[PDB]
């Protein structure tokens, strides 16, 4: 309600797409993006920073790489104030790889104390074609020193011209002797590859060029030598073109090289080019076309000019597995489509990742970027646009990442991710209800009570369609413990806008009404035929967002030129230097900076002198119109500011208009103001903060008809705060929900006897019918039978006042005027806070009724008990009784009663499905034993966390003969626990008689082993899993004289019965048992 709609700042820039994205920055600027602005040749998107003092916008200069084509820079923005930083991204970067067009993204990280850097730090790579390149160099006697030296310098040059591991090399020098200086395998393992060339020495000798090629083709291109099957095979022969001594010719070796798909370059040395014999030799060696594959040894750029090659990628378009096409990975990733700052580094959403299954990259400072997404197993995540929106959540100290996926199953959903070990894994999910609603298009973490931990996540579904209205925001509170994440409530805009796109943009503004509860702002840019609007929603205790908005601001309300008002939002910082937070709202071609106004609260106290009208004042000894009686009225106003961080002069001037009314709504007012000679008076004053009091003289007629009902004085006021000159006439305003009507009562003395002042004794007492104790969580209401009595003179306006802790609250129940008497009593009540803090008082006032002598009244007062009540182990309810006439009191008759309190919890232990059902053993296996397992699981199905102890009872002996050997209790899942053992001897009886009744070995007749596992905190919806594992012997069964017997273990839950009570009726489920059946057989 305190968003200023009159004094306002509006930024206008001609640039295309201006206002499409906004963000507050460094408590100084509004940074605005203009994604469609053409800033340069094949470059789109521009940034602007907008100041409040200047009221104008200046562009932000950035060195944009030539590799970044049409980024749509400023399409998404983000900022943080930990250190002040800005993040501006262009997610539509067009990258041309071959004849494919890629769509990646580029972001810029800005800050005052840092130099501007980019994310991702590296340019996007094109798919490079693998190529296995073999050098075959002539080291014959015809090659001479420098010529050979030049040949090696050629090799050094070429190797440096190719990237790894796209290209890798192999070198064999030939003469009449062959030497492979390094193979593809050796090259692949090399740290510095150019170190291998330092050792190469010439072999002299003859020149077996043809045979060398055959050797290379047969050997060096094999996988055993480190060659790759998919790599292009290239052979570079460096020779002086004179082959002497070889028993083979090129006609013999080259056809095999061609069948192997080996591209061959002939690099000429010395006189190789001029001589006819040598030139033909180079032609035979080289591939076709020949002149394109023949070069001088001096030309080091020969190969590079021909290839720095890319492998063309054939896309599996429209989900087609066929056509031998590769699938989308990070080609269309669009990094930076969304962005958020997290303590461990900035996070950039990548919507197009892996067939638009999405995800987001975390970029930790000075570390390798990690990729956050759904597991590969989730095929349904395809075309879900995960990472369309990105938000940071803090469950406590834990850093959680929320990603929206508005296209998931055409309905949309949001997913939370946290780090386990060094691995990012999904924690929770929540799904939209209506198809096309774009659930998860926008996200907003809200810390309602400002403890540093996210209580709640707002999820936008902008295109949700009802016939009357459009757009929806889900309130999804972060789940406690192992509880599932679900949306508690939903928020709507006003009706009449079926395509209003309510929830298109979300932001946290902070606490604006000073209730210490964080407030939010939701944009609806489609309302009123795309003029747009903005909603302010208050925060609510027991963290939820208020169902109804506190203020709505239409674009039309502000300007006739406004379009898409609220398409982008950003608040929480103070940009107007007044100390109060300000909101930045985006629109088409415009950005508006709205400020919040300081909020005031006014308290009222009214009292009379004298407090009660003396009986002397009213008595008709005639002269019927006679001397009036005077009563003094003291009215005190108290004005404190609700906005605590307001900078400036301590005092806030404010114009207050008072309206006073004596006996309002009455035919004959029983008093008049001496000033106006009527029952109405008005004051207009200008008050500073805190207290101000004034006196008014009242005139009571000499005689009046009604001397029973007390004279009432009604005060109501309006408040217009004087404009603060220092902050462009910022005006303090009264809270919207503030009480404006105040009423004081002036009682008459009552006439009992003759000149006898009335005296009433009043006693109160109440019991709790039905219950001796209160089980919080199981008792949602508390009924008190309250009896009041008056043994004396009549009491008028008898009131009964209850006092109780916060968990309790009075509830008016209505069932009356049935056949018979439900007509008896009428009550009027209201609930208000009392004390330092923590206690409450409900005062019920009995009117219509003259409470006469001896007569007593009883009624049923019903209180609601919150299932989350913080009562403790004892609940104290007090009841004070009083009347219109303020007796000296302190005569007690103020009743109080304390009540025993326990807390409802629901715990269950059960036998798991997977255990040892039976063991079969032959008559000759008395010596043997076999492993047997009993599994139990414990669940908390209640609404409360509690410490528990799980006990296990395992029979291990029968008459000092082993039954279950080496029983060990294990809990592989959730293991940080304890388990103590206590041997227990069984109460002695005839075991044969016991077995005869039913073939069962339990802890009654057998030596048992008692395990105790304490759980410090058993969370809600938490599941514990225990296993009793040991060796079950067959020998002891011999004593029993039954062919088959049952061995039974028992599990039992225990907790503090003084503090807790198992959910009534479910006590039986705190105990469970499992049975292994031993069965004997003969052959058949």
């Amino acid at each position: 309600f305190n968003l200023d709609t009159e004094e306002l700042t509006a930024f206008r820039v001609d640039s295309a797409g201006f206002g499409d994205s906004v963000v507050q920055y460094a408590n100084s600027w509004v940074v605005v993006g203009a994604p469609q602005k053409i800033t340069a040749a094949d470059q789109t998107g521009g940034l602007y920073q907008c100041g409040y003092s200047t009221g104008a916008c200046e562009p932000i200069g950035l060195q944009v790489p030539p590799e970044a084509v049409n980024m749509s820079l400023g399409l998404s923005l983000a900022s943080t104030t930990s250190p002040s930083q800005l993040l501006a991204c262009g997610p539509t970067v067009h990258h041309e790889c071959g004849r494919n067009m890629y769509l990646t993204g580029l972001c810029f990280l800005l800050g005052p104390t840092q130099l501007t850097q980019r994310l991702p730090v590296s340019r996007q790579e094109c798919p490079r074609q693998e190529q296995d390149i073999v050098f075959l160099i002539d080291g014959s006697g015809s090659i001479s020193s420098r010529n050979f030296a030049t040949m090696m310098n050629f090799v050094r040059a070429v190797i440096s011209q190719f990237q790894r591991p796209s290209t890798q090399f192999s070198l064999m020098q030939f003469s009449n002797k062959f030497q492979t200086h390094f193979t593809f395998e050796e090259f692949r393992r090399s740290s510095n590859p150019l170190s291998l060339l330092a050792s190469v020495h010439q072999l002299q000798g003859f020149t077996y060029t043809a045979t060398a090629i055959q050797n290379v083709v047969h050997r060096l291109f094999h996988a055993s030598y480190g060659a790759r099957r998919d790599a292009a095979k290239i052979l570079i022969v460096i020779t002086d073109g004179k082959k002497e001594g070889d028993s083979l010719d090129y006609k013999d070796v080259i056809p095999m090289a061609d069948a192997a798909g080996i591209i061959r370059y002939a690099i000429g040395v010395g006189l190789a080019f001029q001589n006819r014999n040598s030139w033909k030799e180079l032609n035979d060696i080289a591939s076709k076309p020949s002149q394109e594959h023949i070069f001088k040894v001096e030309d080091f750029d020969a190969l590079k000019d021909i290839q720095n090659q890319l492998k063309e990628k054939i896309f599996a378009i429209e989900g087609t597995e066929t056509t031998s096409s590769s699938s989308f990975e990070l080609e269309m990733a669009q990094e930076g489509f969304s962005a958020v700052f997290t303590p461990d580094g900035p996070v950039l959403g990548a919507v197009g990742s892996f067939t638009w299954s999405g995800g987001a990259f975390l970029y930790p400072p000075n570390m390798d970027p990690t990729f956050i997404n759904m597991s590969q197993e989730n095929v349904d995540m395809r075309d879900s646009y995960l990472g369309y929106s990105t938000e940071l959540a803090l469950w406590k100290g834990v850093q959680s990442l929320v990603l929206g996926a508005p296209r998931y199953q055409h309905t949309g959903k949001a997913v939370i991710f946290t780090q386990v070990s060094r691995q990012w894994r999904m924690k929770a999910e929540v799904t939209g209800t209506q198809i096309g609603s774009y659930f998860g298009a926008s996200l907003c973490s809200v810390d309602v009570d400002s403890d540093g931990s996210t209580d709640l996540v707002l999820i936008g579904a902008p295109h949700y369609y009802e016939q009357t209205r459009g757009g929806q925001v889900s309130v999804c509170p972060l789940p406690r413990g192992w509880r599932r994440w679900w949306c508690d409530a939903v928020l709507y805009g006003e009706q009449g806008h079926p395509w209003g796109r309510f929830g298109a943009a979300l932001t946290v503004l902070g606490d604006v009404n000073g209730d210490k509860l964080t407030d939010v702002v939701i944009g609806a840019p489609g309302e009123e035929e795309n003029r747009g609007a903005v909603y302010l929603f208050h925060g609510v205790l027991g963290p939820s967002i208020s169902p109804s908005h506190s203020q709505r601001i239409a674009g039309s309300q502000l300007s006739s030129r406004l379009q898409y008002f609220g398409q982008a939002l950003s608040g929480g910082q103070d940009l107007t230097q007044d100390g109060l937070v300000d909101l930045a709202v985006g629109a088409r071609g415009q950005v508006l900076l709205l400020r919040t106004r300081p909020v005031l609260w006014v308290g009222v106290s009214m009292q009379f002198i004298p407090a009660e009208i003396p009986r002397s004042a009213f008595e008709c000894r005639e002269q019927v119109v006679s001397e009036q009686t005077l009563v003094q009225s003291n009215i005190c106003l108290y004005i404190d500011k609700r906005s605590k961080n307001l900078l400036g002069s301590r005092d806030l001037q404010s114009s207050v208009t008072l309206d006073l009314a004596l006996d309002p709504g009455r035919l004959s007012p029983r008093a008049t103001f001496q000033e106006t000679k009527t029952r109405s008076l008005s004051r207009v004053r200008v008050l500073g903060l805190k207290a101000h009091c004034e006196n008014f003289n009242l005139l009571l007629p000499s005689c009046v008809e009604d001397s029973v009902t007390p004279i009432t004085l009604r005060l109501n006021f309006t408040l217009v705060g004087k404009p603060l000159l220092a902050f462009r006439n910022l005006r303090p305003m009264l809270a919207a929900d503030a009480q404006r009507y105040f009423t004081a009562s002036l009682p008459f003395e009552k006439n009992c006897g003759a000149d006898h002042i009335c005296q009433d004794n009043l006693g109160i007492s109440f019991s709790f019918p039905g219950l001796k104790s209160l089980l919080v969580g199981s008792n949602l209401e508390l009924n008190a039978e309250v009896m009041v009595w008056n043994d004396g003179e009549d009491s008028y306006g008898t009131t009964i006042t209850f006092s109780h802790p916060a968990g309790l609250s009075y509830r008016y129940v209505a069932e009356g005027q049935k056949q018979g008497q439900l007509r008896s009593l009428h009550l009027t009540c209201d609930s208000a806070p009392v004390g330092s803090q923590g206690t409450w008082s409900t005062s019920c006032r009995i009117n219509h009724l003259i409470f006469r002598g001896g007569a007593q009244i009883t009624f049923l007062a019903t209180f609601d008990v919150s299932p989350k009540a913080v009562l403790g182990d004892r609940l104290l309810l007090t009841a004070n009784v009083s009347s219109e006439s303020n007796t000296p009191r302190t005569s007690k008759t103020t009743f109080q009663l304390e009540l025993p309190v326990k807390y409802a919890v629901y715990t269950v232990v059960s036998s798991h499905e997977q255990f040892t059902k039976y063991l079969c053993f032959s008559e000759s296996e008395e010596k043997e034993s076999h492993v047997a397992m009993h599994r139990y699981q414990v669940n908390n199905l209640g609404q409360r966390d509690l410490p528990v102890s799980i006990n296990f009872w395992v029979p291990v002996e029968l008459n000092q003969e082993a039954v279950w050997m080496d029983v060990e209790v294990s809990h592989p899942q959730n293991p940080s626990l304890r388990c103590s053992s206590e041997k227990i001897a069984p109460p002695a009886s005839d075991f044969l008689a016991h077995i005869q009744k039913n073939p069962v070995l339990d802890c009654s007749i057998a030596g048992c082993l008692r395990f105790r596992c304490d759980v410090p905190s058993f969370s809600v919806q938490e599941e514990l899993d225990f296993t009793l594992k040991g060796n079950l012997s067959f020998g002891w069964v011999r004593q029993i004289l039954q062919k088959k017997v049952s061995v039974v273990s028992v599990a039992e839950i225990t907790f503090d019965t003084s503090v807790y009570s198992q959910l009534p009726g479910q006590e039986a489920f705190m105990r469970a048992q499992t049975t292994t059946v031993l069965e004997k057989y003969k052959p058949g």
Binding site: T320, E466, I850
Partner: protein
Amino acid sequence: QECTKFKVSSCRECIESGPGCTWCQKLNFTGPGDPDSIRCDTRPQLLMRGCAADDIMDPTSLAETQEDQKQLSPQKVTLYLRPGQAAAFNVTFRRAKGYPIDLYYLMDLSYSMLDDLRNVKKLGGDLLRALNEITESGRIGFGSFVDKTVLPFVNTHPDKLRNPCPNKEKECQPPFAFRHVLKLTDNSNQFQTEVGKQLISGNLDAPEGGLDAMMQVAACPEEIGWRKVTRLLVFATDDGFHFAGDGKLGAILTPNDGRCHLEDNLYKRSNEFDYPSVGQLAHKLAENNIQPIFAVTSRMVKTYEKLTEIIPKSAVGELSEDSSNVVQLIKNAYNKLSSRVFLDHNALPDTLKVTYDSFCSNGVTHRNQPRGDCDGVQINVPITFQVKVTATECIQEQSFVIRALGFTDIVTVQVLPQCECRCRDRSLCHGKGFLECGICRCDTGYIGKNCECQTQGRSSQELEGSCRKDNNSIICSGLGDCVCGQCLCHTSDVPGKLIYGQYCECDTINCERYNGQVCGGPGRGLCFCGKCRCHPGFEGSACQCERTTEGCLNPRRVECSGRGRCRCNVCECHSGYQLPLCQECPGCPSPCGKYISCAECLKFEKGPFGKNCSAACPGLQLSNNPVKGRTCKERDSEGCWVAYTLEQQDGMDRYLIYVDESRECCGG
């Protein structure tokens, strides 16, 4: 019946108080001490006190029908509405044998539809045959679509733009959003030759811009060539659809304007506008009375089925992967459309609440529904909807239309208010006030049944005895002034607070509180002296409960599984089954132990439950294949261990049991 006494000074004030309130106009029906408040009460307590049956004034809601089209009758109704009292009339729907039908076929040309597009020759004749079989006089026409031609939807590389297909095929076509190929025509050979003429196209991502094409078809009735007859739009595709919001990936933020953009039978500005919203498309379709038929592959059926909830008049049919079964699809889809009839109404004020009772030939009856719904509607077999219209106020001159969805035929309803009496003498009332409807209505300042007093004056004693409820009460409850024997209640200036009653003992703000407001606020109900009188469509002590059961049922309409009954849109689940819809019970004991006899019965035909069987195991259905339930293993009648599984189904203790044929004995 029942009457709240709110304002009793007048007859109209009495009628407005409640629908059960009636008025007595007999002069001197009041005793010398009796007030005028007893003139206004229910019929059982009025005649009983001696009031005549003829002069009792009780307006009643009335529906006038003038029937003197064919399908939808009556074609005009005029309602006479009393506040709180419902008026009811019947609307009759008779399905005609045949209508003229315009069939527009939206064809997917993306590369994924390659094999469906190899059947284009057959497709021409098939589509023609389908239309001829459902219509005597029909027109046909079609258009083609792929997707928006920007990234990431389409590879915008110059080479890929002229040949988007991943393989090297000569017969390919550059990507395009939407192309209107042929206007709706009666020319059969023109349709066949133009359909077969079409070539395959392609793009990058799987979902296509079909919603774009459908929006353009619905927004351009001129270029498409619709008649004022039944309009059918067949949408055929193998994959999903882009909708509003997706355009942001191509830096497209401007909403679809729902306007026609066709240049040379093309959507040229498609890269300038975002895809339409689903609700945006649904509205434009209903506005132009277009019933879309979604011919989608099996993979996509469950998805497009979700659309029919947002788009009431639409149908989904499973399309063969080669688009060969298109005829059988269209006929079944058309029949599905026609066999279901919805009866709805346009915009209403807050003061008009309309509900329908559906009486079907189906053998199913719906009552108190926000919309008329009848499935299995047969030809020439008339169905009758009962329309109940209630006003919460004395209303102005208004008119709304009731319409069968999918048809231009309407029912016009004129709404006239019925608040007055028409009952069912001067100088009587001994002064100023003029006599009206059995009593004098005094002028300003003067008050009394015979106007024998004035507020400002003597106001003597002994008449203040009737201003007290009982001897222990304060005169006029202390909330009013005693004048001429009766009570004139005080006027409190508070939002919504009014004091009323003979002794001023009643007010409007003292009732049960829902949310934070009294009686759930003006939306749910109003408060009258302790009790909350709820508005139509609401009920409860605090008007806290809502009538609809839509919140209790699952999408399959199961109504809280079979393990809970619905109250106030909250499933009240017995046993230990949890909220909302009572599907699962986490803390239940294991059912395994007691079904071992039944397991032995079904699978092995033995034990105590042989020939016993079907009678002894009512809730068990046997599956010879493994099920997805909970594991069990117990000992049967002869001691062997029988393994079986229980998959729970909707209802009270009904499971789907799978039993293993291999038992476990110590033999073995």
